[PDB]
């Protein structure tokens, strides 16, 4: 996350990280005790999922192996369309005040809405600097028609501001008015240029796919 600040402790109990061993790979969200939602670009042969702490490596965090994952069938490596994936945990996440199911959307929040994006991705660019504490930044929703770099994607940013997501933030949540509205997808490199908004998968357009994919892989 660029030009953000540490998230208030305990305010992201539905946030997870996908690690390759102990190395950050992507963000994600906990859908339920057996499933994580992330970006399709995050695909790996297997994952270690971090839950239950704003600090990576925290001895109190839960770590769970996840062997299986399922991309949305329309995913394009070139256009970034359909950049979402479900990761099946090998063992159930233990729920508590620090591990909670995310609130999925029932409606699409419109352009102009203030939202928050969070992650453990780099805070600098092009030099990488990975924070241990989960970082947050507030950004405003931008229609894909108003987003020069781009019907199921959104952009988000603040006019004349560097605030954005970066490497390591893919798959993490963009939340608005208490619901999940986006997953970080992609943007310009180097990160953090003003008026260069990041692109997100618009979660409200994938309700059916998320529910059905989980039901088809019980
Ligand atoms: C030691 O150096 C290291 C260590 C680890 C890594 C892999 C770390 N993870 C990844 O970059 C993930 C993987 C899938 C795509 N990713 C994004 O975060 N994309 C999101 C993304 C990437 C670049 C610019 C962006 C601008 C705006 C919004 C999103 C952007 C790299 C260098």
Q: Could you please report the per-residue DSSP string of 70-91?
A: EE-TT--TTT-TT--EEEE-SS
Rounded Cα gap, residues 14 and 26, in angstroms: 14
In order of 19, 36, 93, 196, the CA distances from 214 in angstroms are 22, 10, 15, 35
Task: Give the residue from 180, 59, 199, 58 showing the smallest Cα distance to 120.
Answer: 58
Contact 169, 27 (CB under 8 A): yes
Task: Give the residue from 104, 110, 172 showing the smallest Cα distance to 140.
Answer: 110
The fold for domain 13-101+207-218 equals Thrombin, subunit H (2.40.10)
Q: Report how many helices (DSSP H) and strands (DSSP E) the chain contains, helices first.
A: 1, 14
In order of 17, 134, 176, the CA distances from 55 in angstroms are 10, 6, 23
**Residues forming beta bridges with residue 182, ordered by sequence position:** 174, 202
Q: Buried b vs exposed e over 108-117: b needs ≥16 C-beta within 10 Å?
A: bbebeeebbb
φ/ψ of residue 38, rounded to 5: -150, -170
Active-site option among 83, 125, 169, 185: 83
Could you please report the per-residue DSSP string of 55-70? BTT-TTSEEEEE-EEE
**Residues forming beta bridges with residue 78, ordered by sequence position:** none
Rounded Cα gap, residues 11 and 15, in angstroms: 9
Rounded Cα gap, residues 37 and 174, in angstroms: 12
Active-site option among 25, 41, 50, 72: 41
In order of 18, 36, 127, the CA distances from 50 in angstroms are 6, 11, 25
Instruction: Report whether residue 121 contacts ligand 1, using a CB cutoff of 6 Å.
Output: yes
Task: Extract the runs of DSSP E, i.e. beta strands, from the chain.
Answer: 5-6, 15-20, 23-32, 35-38, 47-51, 62-66, 68-71, 85-88, 114-119, 135-142, 153-157, 173-176, 179-186, 198-202
Could you tell me which residues come within 8 angstroms of residue 109 by beta carbon, excluding any fewer than 6 positions away?
115, 141, 176, 177, 179, 181, 204
Rounded Cα gap, residues 34 and 61, in angstroms: 17
Cα 40 to ligand 1 centre (Å): 13
**Residues forming beta bridges with residue 201, ordered by sequence position:** 153, 183
User: Is 83 annotated as catalytic?
Assistant: yes
Could you tell me which residues come within 8 angstroms of residue 77 by beta carbon, excluding any fewer than 6 positions away?
41
Same fold, 1-12+102-206 and 13-101+207-218: yes
In order of 48, 57, 117, 129, the CA distances from 150 in angstroms are 32, 36, 19, 27
Resolution in A: 1.1
Rounded Cα gap, residues 82 and 105, in angstroms: 17
Most distant CA atoms of the chain, gap in Å: 46
Task: Give the residue extent of every domain in the chain.
Answer: 1-12+102-206, 13-101+207-218
Instruction: Report whether residue 168 contacts ligand 1, using a CB cutoff of 6 Å.
Output: yes
**Probe target for ligand 1 pocket from 167, 172, 192, with the most ligand atoms within 8 Å of CB:** 167
Task: Give the residue from 30, 23, 14, 16 showing the smallest Cα distance to 44.
Answer: 23
- CATH architecture for segment(s) 1-12+102-206: Beta Barrel (2.40)
**Residues forming beta bridges with residue 50, ordered by sequence position:** 17, 63
Q: Solved how?
A: X-ray
Q: Tell me which DSSP letter residue 204 carries.
A: G
Token pair of 112, please?
């102009």
Cα 166 to ligand 1 centre (Å): 6
Residue nearest to atom 31 of ligand 1 (CA): 167
- Would you mind telling me the total number of residues written for the chain in this entry? 218
State whether residue 177 is helix, strand or coil. Answer: coil
């Amino acid at each position: 996350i660029i030009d953000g600040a540490p998230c208030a402790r305990g305010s992201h109990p539905w946030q997870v990280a996908l690690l390759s061993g102990n190395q950050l790979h992507c963000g994600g969200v906990l859908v339920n005790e057996r499933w994580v939602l992330t970006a399709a670009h995050c695909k790996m042969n297997e994952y270690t999922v971090h839950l239950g702490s704003d600090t990576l490596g925290d001895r109190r965090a839960q770590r769970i192996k996840a062997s299986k994952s399922f991309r949305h069938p329309g995913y394009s490596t070139q256009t970034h369309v359909n950049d979402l994936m479900l990761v099946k945990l090998n063992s159930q996440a233990r729920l508590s005040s620090m591990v909670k199911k995310v609130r999925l959307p029932s409606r699409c929040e419109p352009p102009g809405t203030t939202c928050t994006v969070s992650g453990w991705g780099t805070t600098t660019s092009p030099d990488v600097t990975f924070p241990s504490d989960l970082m947050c930044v507030d950004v405003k929703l931008i229609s894909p028609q108003d987003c020069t770099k781009v019907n199921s994607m959104l952009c988000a940013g603040i006019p004349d501001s560097k605030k954005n997501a970066c490497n390591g933030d893919s798959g993490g949540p963009l939340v608005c008015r208490g619901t999940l509205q986006g997953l970080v997808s992609w943007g310009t490199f180097p990160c953090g240029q003003p008026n260069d908004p990041g692109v997100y998968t618009q979660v409200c357009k994938f309700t059916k796919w998320i529910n059905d994919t989980m039901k088809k892989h019980r």
